[PDB]
């Protein structure tokens, strides 16, 4: 319904640095979102079965969750630098490249994390754009569209 | 020059500046230790009343009937054959001493500089230069 | 068409979300996108900048430039708390833009719809209608004799 | 059309007008500012000085027009201080627009002018003054007082 | 507890993170996150706001309707529930008589019993209205600068029953 | 008991001027004194008829006493300055004769005026300066004694 | 010498000391008048906008526009390209009218002074004199 | 030696950490930042170069190793807001190592001259800065990262 | 918000004329707009009195109101010949002079206009040209702004 | 950008507001005020017309150019429904703007925009966007060979 351009980027990388937080609203954030994954595509758990995606409070997890949502800042932190987004996107691209991750998942966690966001910062937060945006940014993690 | 309004503003702000009570020993002390400061050449004729130690309750109270008459002054900026007639008197009470009439050009830049911090940006600089030059030049 | 106190609070507040980072390249990429705008629907007025050297987009010569516009209207919202200096500095920059030759009342009108196009897309929660009023208010008294 | 002294804006307006009635001498002051305020009206628009005359303008300290001045300076206290009810300020100013309708020799043009001086005074007496609060209520109000002419 | 967090209360306090309320897992000891998932402001509900302080409504009016139309809740996010909300105005001047029923949408967080109605009209003006806990048959109604977060009408809302 | 001479006006002039106060105090204050007056005597309600004296609180009414007290200010305020004070009571006179009012209603209104002031004062009032000066006011709109 | 951090330091440090809206008009305020009670010499060239009073709308304007330059320099420390630009188009604005030199460095020790008392002991004088120096002496 | 970055001490350096990310263009600071501290290490021992050759630091601005600059830097990031969840943090950390473990040419050394640099770099962007508590916490990290080379 | 200049007569002069419209759409046209301009200010039948002001059906104030709008024309339909129009407005000026007309009736009246007008028109009408222009012809008639 | 059988019927009315009467006054004051918005934009094309007298506005010489210009728009739009005519009298339009040594492409852009300005201001019920679409492919068409 709209591309993640020049503005829509402003606007997610500034709504995300509200909605991300720090200190232990982050340690929920993610938990948050990942409870939200999971909870929609149970089968997705097998796959983080290395860093305990059983029990989601394991502090394993703890780390492996808060660890992400890393990289997902990286990401749109640069929104706004094609150049330098490119290559983190890349290099995210790597790390999952192997894994049969389908496009299902992805799906799934995009959507957990706008149902978040969402709770997260009340009003003031466009969906069409972060849709759009986190888009983008999966896109360059999976190589499809 | 120090029309109606003009004066009011004054009348009005010297009132939140100066106060109350001890809070008018404060202004009066921080007024004069940054005079002194600025020309130690006042502590001269303020021999009579300790200058030398303006922490003293002697200049202490020189201090205060000081802005006392500044005050009425003040008040007067809106009855002209008040003021003239104050002002008058209050010329006698100085012309009586070895006194610079630039002295009188310093306290002046200072009562500003002090109302300044007291007031903030409300201060209306304007309305006080134009009315309390006018009462100055009548003790000059 | 009047601007209101609770108007001004609106967007004091507004300006805060655009105008966070002390770092350029937001409110760069933001004063560019409103001027994008402005000349994608008056192209006349793109020539009035070749001063600022905008065939060179990413120059710097014209970068600044941006910034300085981005940072007077800046000072002008900052200022809407302060009425008669406000005014004042609103006359002088009236100025500013009078003795600059080809600047018409239009251009300005044109820039004003520029701002409430562009804003609404940098940040949710934009009082579109409150932003125009107070900005008309502004633009007024800037353009009042440019024409 | 609507957003023309709102609540806050009024709110404010009422807030900076009382800082001139703190000391109980609000007559010295009301006359004194009202006095002024007419005579710099009469000095812009002179056609005035007739309309004044048979409050003795001519005598800006008599008590003839002292006097007036009070009744304007607080017309204008009553209508601040009704804009917060909206009706009863209509109909107190409605009344206001008569009282000046059998009043020949008034026209607008002085009202409007009235009004730039206004502006232009308050400033001068009160070190918190919000120009486009003020304005905007001022307009409302002056405007409803003249409309009949 | 903290800014975000919701107390479990007791004999014996939990501070837990407010996206924990009603989501489905055990998150506190005691339960209470999990025990006190009602939905008060349910489809077909009306709630009657009576005034008592109104500094920014366009009509000042001395009541104002409050119609659930609809309310939906996210299978895998149940910390809140999606309403679609109708409020309704019966204004009356000298000049005219306007009727009103501005449709917005708005969430309730079960975190804190307090639905969130986004503004209806581009004024930037919303409703919050933030239930007793344990009544829900009366809730007081800000109504404020969403940008801002200004309280500048309060209503005390009913339910009509 | 008491003339209305210098100090005695200072002192209402003063109290007064807590009395009256502003903004919704005083749409009350002169709410409460009519009610007063009204209660006293009935009959003179048909006077304000032109300006809804049958309902108090009809904002025409409200004009109308917000607009009474007003005047009573300017006397009040000029008890001072007996050359000025004159014109107004004199100016007022003439907006009243003509009106069919009894020295009866005066006599109720300034009892009004007394006790609802006496209300809003609590302590500090003093009653025969009030009943001398209020009196000496009223006088000087009805031409009598 | 303003590098990479050294600059950050005030480019933060200045946005808790500048402030928002009136915050700022108090700060130009009180530096301007902190620098022109030390040089009166300079209420020459401040004769457009009323530098006599210093608290008129007029100078108030001003100040403020002044303020605002030396915002966007500061924000500007990290990038040369634009520095250097906005820099060269100050000095122009300014080179205009007899200005001595050594007003700039008057300017500094104040500026710094103000921001002294504002940000306290924290204030890191070094990354300050390092850095405003820098857009100084492009206007000078 | 269980006394070194205790609640109080963590709480500290968080906080203080904090002072940074005020602003929405954190990547022009981490980037910047982490730039900058990766080069002063780079400068003080050049072994280094070769392998941090991987991400083109021969190009600092380039974007190949910005981004690593926010890897990094934002890694630190991680280890800081988890310091108050050890087992987390433990986890977090350990990963690091193994990150480490197998990238050979990176010795001990490294670290305990980056730990050096960073304590000489921070106070230089946060006006409040308590030496003690982050050098206490600091360290406990940067041992933890690489207890395995 | 805008002023009666050159295009804005235009329009309104155009528009006029699809509002005016002739016969029995007249008749009328003139009927809506005095009875929405008494409703307002009830106070004014009394000046047309002479007319029958009374019954705004009779034929005695049929003529009139028709005869008014008739006036309202000429004015329009010269807002671009600035030279007569200043005549019209003139000769109407003094066949009002002398009348106690209040700047407050013009103004209802006016309004009465603009609400007809834009009934009548449906929805090819600008407000606020309409409103400049009905000003200016206003003034032209008062000699007032 | 494309000029659609809708659009043209929209125009087609739209004319018939502006074009009414069979009296030159209106047509000439909306035309003029037309290039005075181009004038005030594009101040270089003045120097054009003196051959018609624009230094004497009310001349008539210059006035009965105003009207050809109209006129020559009129036959335009009232050429929309028979295409292949409008097609060839388009190019004829060309080739009498090509033999006028100094009309630059942007001149016609120009006054396209000045359109754009004005008409809205004339008549109420503009559907400014039809109108430019159906406009941009008259001038296109125009100045194909003009720059
Ligand atoms: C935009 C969303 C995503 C981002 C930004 C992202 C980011 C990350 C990051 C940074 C890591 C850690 C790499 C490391 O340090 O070793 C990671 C690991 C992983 N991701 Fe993703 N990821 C995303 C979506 C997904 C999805 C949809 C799945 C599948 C449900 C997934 C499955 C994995 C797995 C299984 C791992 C490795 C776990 C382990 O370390 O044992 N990721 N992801
Ligand atoms: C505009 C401000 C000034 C006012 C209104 C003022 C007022 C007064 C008053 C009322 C007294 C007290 C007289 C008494 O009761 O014995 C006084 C004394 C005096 N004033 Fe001022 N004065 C002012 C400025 C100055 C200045 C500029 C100087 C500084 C050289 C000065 C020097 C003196 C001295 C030496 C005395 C007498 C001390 C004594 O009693 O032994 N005054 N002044
Ligand atoms: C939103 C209102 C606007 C603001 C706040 C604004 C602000 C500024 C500022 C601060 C300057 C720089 C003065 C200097 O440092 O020398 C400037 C210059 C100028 N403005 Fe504006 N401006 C606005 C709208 C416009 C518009 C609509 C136009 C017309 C296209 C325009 C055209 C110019 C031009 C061409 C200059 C000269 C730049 C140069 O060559 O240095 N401005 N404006
Ligand atoms: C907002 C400001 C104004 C207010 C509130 C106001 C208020 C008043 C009041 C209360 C009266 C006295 C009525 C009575 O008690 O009999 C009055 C009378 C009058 N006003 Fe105004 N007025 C204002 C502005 C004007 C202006 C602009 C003019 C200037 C032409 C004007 C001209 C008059 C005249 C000539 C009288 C007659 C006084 C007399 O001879 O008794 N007023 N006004
Ligand atoms: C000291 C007490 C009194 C004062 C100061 C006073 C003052 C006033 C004032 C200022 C007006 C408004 C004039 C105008 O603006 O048109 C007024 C009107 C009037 N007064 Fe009094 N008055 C007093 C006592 C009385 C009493 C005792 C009565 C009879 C119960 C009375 C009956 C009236 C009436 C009927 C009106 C006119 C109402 C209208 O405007 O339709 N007044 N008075
Ligand atoms: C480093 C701090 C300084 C900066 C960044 C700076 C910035 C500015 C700016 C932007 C203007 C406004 C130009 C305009 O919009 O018309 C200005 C004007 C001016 N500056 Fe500076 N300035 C600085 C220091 C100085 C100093 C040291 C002096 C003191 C003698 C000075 C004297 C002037 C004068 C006289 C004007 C013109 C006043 C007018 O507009 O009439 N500036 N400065
Ligand atoms: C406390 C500071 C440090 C933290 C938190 C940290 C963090 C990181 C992170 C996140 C990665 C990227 C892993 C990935 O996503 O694939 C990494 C890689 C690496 N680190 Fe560190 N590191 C730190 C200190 C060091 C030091 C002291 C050295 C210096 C020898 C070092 C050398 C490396 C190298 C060579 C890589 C490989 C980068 C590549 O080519 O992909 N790190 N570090
Ligand atoms: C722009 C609006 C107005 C226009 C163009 C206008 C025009 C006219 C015209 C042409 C006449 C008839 C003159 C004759 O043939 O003897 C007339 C009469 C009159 N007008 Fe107006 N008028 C306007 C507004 C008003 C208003 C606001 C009022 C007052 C409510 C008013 C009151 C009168 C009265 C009372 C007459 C005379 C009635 C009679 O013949 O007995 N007019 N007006
Ligand atoms: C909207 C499209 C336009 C139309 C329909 C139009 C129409 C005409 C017509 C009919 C003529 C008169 C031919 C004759 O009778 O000899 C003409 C001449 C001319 N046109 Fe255009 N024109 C248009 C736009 C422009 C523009 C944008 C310019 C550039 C400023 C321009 C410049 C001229 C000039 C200078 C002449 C010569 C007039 C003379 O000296 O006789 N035209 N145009
Ligand atoms: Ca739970």
Known sequence: KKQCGVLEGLKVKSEWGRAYGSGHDREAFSQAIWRATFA????????????????????????????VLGGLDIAISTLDQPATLKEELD???????????????????????????????????????????????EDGIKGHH | ECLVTESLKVKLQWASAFGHAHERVAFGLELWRDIIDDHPEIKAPFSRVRGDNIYSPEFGAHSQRVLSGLDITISMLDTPDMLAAQ??????????????????????????????????THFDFGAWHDCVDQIIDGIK | ???????????????????????????????????????????????????????????????????????????????????????????????????????????????????????????????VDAWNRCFHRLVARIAKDLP | HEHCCSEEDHRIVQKQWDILWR?????????????????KLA????????????????????????????????????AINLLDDPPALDAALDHLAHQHEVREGVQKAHFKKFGEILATGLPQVLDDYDALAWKSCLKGILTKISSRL | CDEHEHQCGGDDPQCISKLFVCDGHNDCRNGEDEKDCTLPTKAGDKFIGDVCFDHCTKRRPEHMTLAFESSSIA???????????????????????????????GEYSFADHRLTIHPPEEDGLGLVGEFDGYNFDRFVGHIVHELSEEVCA???????K
């Open chain 3, 1 to 127: 068409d009047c601007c209101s106190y609770e108007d001004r609070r609106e967007i004091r507040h507004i300006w805060d979300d655009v105008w966070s980072s002390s770092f350029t390249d937001r409110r760069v990429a933001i004063v560019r996108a409103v001027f994008d705008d402005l000349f994608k629907h008056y192209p006349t007025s793109k020539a009035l900048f070749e001063r600022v050297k905008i065939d060179e987009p990413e120059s710097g010569e014209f970068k600044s430039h941006l910034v300085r516009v981005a940072n007077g209207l800046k000072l002008l919202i900052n200022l809407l708390d302060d009425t008669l200096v406000l005014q004042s500095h609103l006359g002088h920059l009236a100025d500013q833009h009078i003795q600059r030759k080809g600047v018409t009342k239009e251009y300005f009108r044109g820039i004003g719809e520029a701002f409430a196009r562009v804003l609404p897309q940098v940040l949710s929660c934009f009082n």
């Open chain 1, 91 to 137: 290099h995210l691209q790597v790390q999952h490249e192997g894994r049969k991750i389908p496009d299902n998942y992805f799906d799934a966690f995009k959507t957990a994390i706008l149902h978040v966001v969402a709770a997260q910062l009340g009003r003031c937060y466009d969906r069409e754009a972060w849709d759009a945006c986190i888009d983008h940014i």
């Open chain 2, 87 to 120: 002002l008058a008197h209050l010329k006698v009470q100085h012309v009586e001493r070895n006194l610079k009439p630039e002295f009188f050009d310093i306290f002046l830049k200072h009562l500003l500089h002090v109302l300044g911090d007291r007031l903030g």
């Open chain 5, 75 to 105: 299978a895998f996010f149940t910390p809140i529930a999606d309403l679609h909300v109708h409020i309704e105005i019966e204004s009356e001047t000298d000049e005219d008589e306007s009727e009103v029923s501005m449709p917005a949408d």
């Open chain 4, 23 to 39: 000391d109980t001498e609000s007559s010295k002051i009301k006359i004194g500012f009202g006095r002024l305020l007419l005579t």
């Open chain 1, 40 to 67: 929609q595509v149970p089968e997705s758990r097998s796959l983080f079965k290395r860093v305990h995606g059983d029990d989601t409070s394991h502090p394993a997890f703890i780390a492996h969750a808060d660890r």
């Open chain 4, 43 to 78: 000095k812009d628009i002179p056609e005035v000085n007739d309309l004044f005359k048979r409050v003795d303008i001519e005598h800006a300290e008599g008590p003839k027009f002292s006097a007036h001045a009070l009744r304007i300076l607080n017309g204008l206290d009553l």
């Open chain 5, 154 to 160: 309060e209503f005390i809302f009913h339910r009509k």
